[PDB]
Design a protein around this ligand. Structure first.
Ligand SMILES: CNc1ncnc2[nH]cnc12
Ligand SMILES: [Cl-]
Length: 150
């Protein structure tokens, strides 16, 4: 058989999201919202707005030190930078944007550590920092691995 679904798109951008907090992951799944750092929010906002709805901005979530990704979400709005403070575990985040979680599933780093990022010094995708962008051809490979893991 074959899965040629992901191997076909050109308009799409994909970012790693790191979270120190398991509580924040749960709150994001529950309420379909997220917030990054200042520079992270700016990165995501720029990608969402220049995508202008002609493709998805995907977010690959991983809790720092957990050893695995925990799921996939799509950005669903621009960054609102002036919102209620202290809704996350730490009060160091300013703003909010909408997401839609697509997959909630733990995927061990062992399944993904062979994919390396030419834009991040050929480092494994599993050694990324928050809002590291993933080149589309590597992003396709990661997404197929996540969707097929069981
Ligand atoms: C709510 N946003 C976050 N929560 C915990 N850790 C992080 N690292 C980057 N963004 C976050
Ligand atoms: Cl704003």
């Amino acid at each position: 058989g074959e899965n040629l679904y992901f191997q076909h798109m050109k308009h799409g951008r994909v970012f790693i999201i790191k979270s120190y907090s398991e509580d924040d992951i749960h709150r994001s799944i529950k309420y379909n919202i997220w917030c990054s750092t200042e520079h992270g929010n700016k990165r995501l906002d720029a990608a969402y707005r220049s995508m202008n709805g002609k493709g998805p901005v995907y977010l690959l979530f991983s809790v720092n030190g957990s050893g695995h990704f925990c799921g996939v979400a799509e950005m669903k709005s621009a960054v609102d930078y002036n919102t209620c403070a202290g809704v996350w575990s730490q009060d160091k985040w300013k703003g909010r944007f909408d997401v839609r979680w697509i997959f909630v599933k733990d995927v061990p780093n062992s399944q993904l550590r062979h994919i390396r990022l030419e834009n991040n010094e050929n480092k494994p995708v599993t050694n990324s920092r928050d809002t590291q962008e993933v080149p589309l051809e590597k992003a396709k490979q990661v997404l197929k691995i996540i969707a097929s893991y069981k």
